[PDB]
């Protein structure tokens, strides 16, 4: 049950996440205007990557 | 990137405005189209068949 409930938990924050996003009129991305630190970009950029 | 948006947004449109519109036009068409080719042929093939029957005559 506890390994259940953090899938079903994280995934619920996840969704939210996609929640706060910006659907394009017709184009399937996504636009974001959003923050980021600069001094990890690599790191969020190998995040990316994964 | 805002420029691009409306770019391929009216590439997309009217390509597919289009295409909806050509496919009904040329149904639109073909049903005449058939119809007269058929009725020619048909006539034809109808003295194909007096000339056999003068044959079998």
Same mark, same amino acid.
């Given at each position: ?8 938990? +994280? ?6 996440? /996609? &929640? /706060?996003? &910006?659907?394009?009129?017709?184009? +399937?991305? $996504? ?9 990890? /970009? ?5 995040? $990316?990557?994964? | 990137? #805002?420029?691009?948006?409306?770019? #391929? $947004? /009216? ?27 058929? #009725? ?18």
């Amino acid at each position: 049950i506890r390994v259940w409930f953090i899938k079903v938990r +994280k995934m619920k924050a996840i969704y939210h996440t /996609l &929640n /706060l996003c &910006n659907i394009d009129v017709t184009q +399937k991305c $996504l636009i974001a205007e959003v923050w980021c630190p600069v001094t990890d /970009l690599d790191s969020i950029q190998f995040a $990316l990557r994964r | 990137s #805002q420029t691009q948006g409306i770019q #391929q $947004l /009216l590439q997309a449109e009217k390509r597919a405005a289009e295409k909806v519109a050509d496919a009904r036009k040329r149904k639109a068409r073909r049903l005449k189209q058939a119809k007269e080719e058929a #009725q020619m042929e048909v006539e034809q093939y109808r003295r194909e068949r007096e000339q056999e029957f003068q044959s079998k005559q």
